Amino acid sequence: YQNDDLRIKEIKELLPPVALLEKFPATENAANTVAHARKAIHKILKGNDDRLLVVIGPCSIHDPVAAKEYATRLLALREELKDELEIVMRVYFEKPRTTVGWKGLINDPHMDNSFQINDGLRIARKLLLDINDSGLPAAGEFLDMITPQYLADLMSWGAIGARTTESQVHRELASGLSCPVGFKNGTDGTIKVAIDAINAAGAPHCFLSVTKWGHSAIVNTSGNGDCHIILRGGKEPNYSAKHVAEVKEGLNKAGLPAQVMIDFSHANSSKQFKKQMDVCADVCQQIAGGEKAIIGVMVESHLVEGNQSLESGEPLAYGKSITDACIGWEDTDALLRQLANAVKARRG
Amino acid sequence: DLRIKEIKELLPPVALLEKFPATENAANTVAHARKAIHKILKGNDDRLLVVIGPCSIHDPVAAKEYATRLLALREELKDELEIVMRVYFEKPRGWKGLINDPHMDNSFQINDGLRIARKLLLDINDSGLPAAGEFLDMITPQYLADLMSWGAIGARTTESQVHRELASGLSCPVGFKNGTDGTIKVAIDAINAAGAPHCFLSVTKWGHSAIVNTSGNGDCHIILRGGKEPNYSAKHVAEVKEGLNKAGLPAQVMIDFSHANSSKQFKKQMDVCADVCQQIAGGEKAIIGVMVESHLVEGNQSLLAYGKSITDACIGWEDTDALLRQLANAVKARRG
Amino acid sequence: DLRIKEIKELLPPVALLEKFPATENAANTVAHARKAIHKILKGNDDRLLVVIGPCSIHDPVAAKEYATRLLALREELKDELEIVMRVYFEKPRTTVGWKGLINDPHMDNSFQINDGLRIARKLLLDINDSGLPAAGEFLDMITPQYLADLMSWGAIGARTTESQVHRELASGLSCPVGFKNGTDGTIKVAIDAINAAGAPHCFLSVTKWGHSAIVNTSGNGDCHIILRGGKEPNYSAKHVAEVKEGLNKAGLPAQVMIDFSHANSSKQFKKQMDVCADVCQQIAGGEKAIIGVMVESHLVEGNQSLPLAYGKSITDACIGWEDTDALLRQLANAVKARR
Amino acid sequence: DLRIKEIKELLPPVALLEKFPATENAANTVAHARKAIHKILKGNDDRLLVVIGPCSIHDPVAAKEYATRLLALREELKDELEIVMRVYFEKPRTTVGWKGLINDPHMDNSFQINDGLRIARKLLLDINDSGLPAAGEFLDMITPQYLADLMSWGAIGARTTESQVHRELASGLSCPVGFKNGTDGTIKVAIDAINAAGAPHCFLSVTKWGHSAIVNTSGNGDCHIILRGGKEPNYSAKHVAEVKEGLNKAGLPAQVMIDFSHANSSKQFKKQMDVCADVCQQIAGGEKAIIGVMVESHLVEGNQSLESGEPLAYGKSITDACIGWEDTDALLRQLANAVKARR
């Protein structure tokens, strides 16, 4: 065709979602994990459970071995702390870049710009399956419009990133997802874009999308009422009581329940991974002092703290982020126990 | 699953491309206008790209009447201006636009809407008038982009990786709007992102998802659309030019006369025009394009009257003729 | 894998249907001719279905000339005959050979099938739009989605009458279907096919979207046998009596279509004129079981080997227009006598 | 679409290939048997291809027990026979009846074709992975894309030997292909089919993505005739000599596979043992043109009728009747001794 594909270099075959769903079906226990976690989060969001949703884990997954070791450790704490916390592992396979960079395990699993996306989808779904089958629910970021069909049935919660909260196609996607969805405030701190997103996601929509067969189609969604805001900072952090109070008022002014999830990382830690523990201290004091609106938190955590560079060509250290820096396991254990103690204090 | 109510059949792009293929004339219109804009962006033509037309298309009849009037000025002023008709089918916000609801009744006859939209784009290009589109999603461009000589990324998606990926593979030049607060950082990031090659998942002309690799698109530029205050003045242009230079990008801008630069007052577009013409006539080479919301009849309507916008308010045809002549005279002055 | 050398993109049927939609006239032509053949097959009409035209289409310009001439005779003889043009785009070869216009439109082994489908559907659309109904052989399992909405009647070839997938195909077609007897002359295989095609089936097929799917059909009751010879011709009234009796035993209407060409003519196109005389005398003598005939006819008689000569078949030899005009008049006269 | 009542979703072949990929053992089994059959067809091996197994598979459990028994004889008789298990899923018929494991795996008219494709591929995978190669029948154009990578040999349905579409299919199959003689016992149509299938073709087909496409094939030279009787059995030395003549006259290798069942056994399953005796006689005497045989065999001889609301006998055909394991063991040993005697 004339005037077509000047800037398209190559087009390669993509496994349809049904191929990944057939190769890696949910086990009974994996399906149980997803169903129970989605119901638990819904109950929190409706105000009928006083526990704290905790979405915690690596900035990005790049190594299934370390991810499964992390998952075993986190599952132990999920079981120990379950009367206070609903613990869901961050299993992020897609990373939004400020400009350019390794986009994650699905886009480039082999970490060498070979872009073996079919391998990436196989690795990602098998890992999500293993984690859910172990009994640990999983959270993801919905950035790509096409990858969710491959994974969403194994997601108990999802986030739409700050750079896409305003995006109509992402709001439409959320309106048809089967899990609860968090919408982050705008990268400059703006709350209104996330409030608008929650309202849009709760409405039914009609739009173009791709089916489990890998074919484009017209899709009609019902709307998703299980959406809430994620506070992730702006030019300055926005986790403190003053900010939470402003957001509660803004939600209620818009007719929405005053409830927030606080991201301890990103702009709320000023991109300094150990400051997540300082955010934790402040948020724990708010919770223990009686703040009911804090229904969830999000934490970037790995086996080993800090981060490392893929671009150097050095062999990668095990269990250590190749993207944002994370707190390590010992801080993670302490942080989770701090949150559990705060939730117990809030209740008693 | 739980929250998917219904899934309906969608014609693949190849069906629309086969039903409404580009005529030799339409193909030539697109090809020459893309090349003309590229030369402007490369600094090898001192003419001004002018993207002008309705806020959104709801009536193909009125749109083709508008196209005929505009083609006359495009040919008349061609030594100073590269005139491209704004052919936007939706207003991001209501009525979901011509593609999503051509019959205006919440029937969501998207297959009909795609047929109507492509036919209109084909007819306008066949007459010799190039068209400019807005790229709001990842699926509709496959049906229409071969008939687009320029496109804008929605302001709500400048920051979105998936829309920067899309731009990196588009065959036409692309404008990225500045941030809602008037800052340009996100737009600079978007131009840098869109300039690089990407690998991502997309839907082919066959209606199947696939892995696509793009080359990167060097024909991307900023659109100034205002922040809390208008940012069309010579002071703001100087600020934007320095920030572009600091980022290693060509110090060039397109200025949107409408929206926050017109302070939400359609007639104020003529005021931005007078100010921008002064800058150009005074020698400002960095202003390479403008965007104007214009229809047959000025104002707007609410879902009736013919040739009058049913979304945002536009200047009517007499102001449009005057505006285009003012810009052409300014370009003449700048040339010397 | 090892014996697949190339896989190339194929336009889906929706693309052809959108580019070349049925005009109002084309749709009316198809609906009327389908209704007319159904009326003839139900015995509620005494006219003769005449499926006549080139062995194969290889030149749309000559086909449109042929169509204009045949349309005039269709209008002239409309009281005795329901005239339907052979528009055959698919050719079953005894071994290897040019498979028709769709498979290789440029007859040079370039296999531009997307071009072939556009050419074929445009031609079929133009012919129906003029008012002339069309007939084809349904050989390919995937091409019928591109063309069947413009077909008023179809044939299953002698070499595929036994084929389960072709019986399934026929069970879901919107047009009447004829089944040729076996190449040895066996009648049973065509009777089995008619019974199978009349029943609902569930099988794998390709949709108008170009995707494979599970398809359920209703069954096609407008099917009938086509007598086309075997070792010896089987058009004589003795053979016709044998077939009507075999049809009765199987509980099927005792009606036949007779193919004047192929083994009935001993592969000699002029002998089609001799078969015509014999069949006309059966009809004029009172034979109501002969509900239709099939004739291989072109602008110029004979055939040629594969520039080409105008109006001559590049596959089986056919009779020319003069013989064609006279044959149709003989048949209409025979119908008028029978009535 | 007046006579199309319903259209239902179908898993594309890639979904089955991803769920049930060929193991290394399975892929090796397929490769080695395809090569061994090629050598036999080209005269570089004096061993006998034996395709043997149930008329149709209705029970994967009995099928795998049969495979385990057959594999043991495959190993024991490997110096004389290339033993390939018949893994057929359907009995083609014009009368009504069970539509086979792929169309109706649950044996109840639910037409759960997606289930049936999963069951059929999983069974083929398991049999190949154990080391036993598998032979299939090609009845349509769409199912082979789900299964053919696990077949070492295939037969085109007797009712489609003359069909251009099935000859096109054969011309692009990765395995050797057998074509059956005509219902009246003549070989003309099968000679035409062998010629047509050995030529390159270009035709429309469904890819592993479940999409129709234009496909070009190389031609299949590993095609041969299957003698299956006509009006009378055609396994006798007089008939083999007559077919050898016709194959030479056509410029094709004078080699044949003899089907011991159906018309050659007068539709009486025990008569397969009489055909075996005669064919062993020809082979032991020095007949080199007999390159393979086809035998309908199961754990338990005879057959049974499928009945709603009722259990079935284990290991016994619900389609045509088969010889049972005792006769199968004796038959395989007879053929092996005849091959030893020929050399």
Ligand SMILES: O=C(O)/C(C[C@@H](O)[C@H](O)[C@H](O)COP(=O)(O)O)=N/O
């Ligand atoms: O995971 C999250 O919750 C995220 C995504 C976030 O991790 C992003 O992908 C990188 O911070 C970009 O890194 P860069 O700025 O180097 O492109 N929040 O935004």
Ligand SMILES: O=C(O)/C(C[C@@H](O)[C@H](O)[C@H](O)COP(=O)(O)O)=N/O
């Ligand atoms: O059109 C028909 O009605 C037919 C089909 C017929 O035309 C066939 O395609 C050629 O006779 C094969 O020619 P060859 O024998 O040269 O391959 N009747 O059989």
Ligand SMILES: OC[C@H]1O[C@@H](O)[C@H](O)[C@@H](O)[C@@H]1O
């Ligand atoms: O294993 C199932 C059956 O197989 C047959 O070959 C044997 O004769 C039976 O004794 C056995 O029970």
Ligand SMILES: OC[C@H]1O[C@H](O)[C@H](O)[C@@H](O)[C@@H]1O
């Ligand atoms: O970087 C790759 C370059 O070539 C691409 O094909 C584009 O035409 C150009 O804009 C880009 O800068």
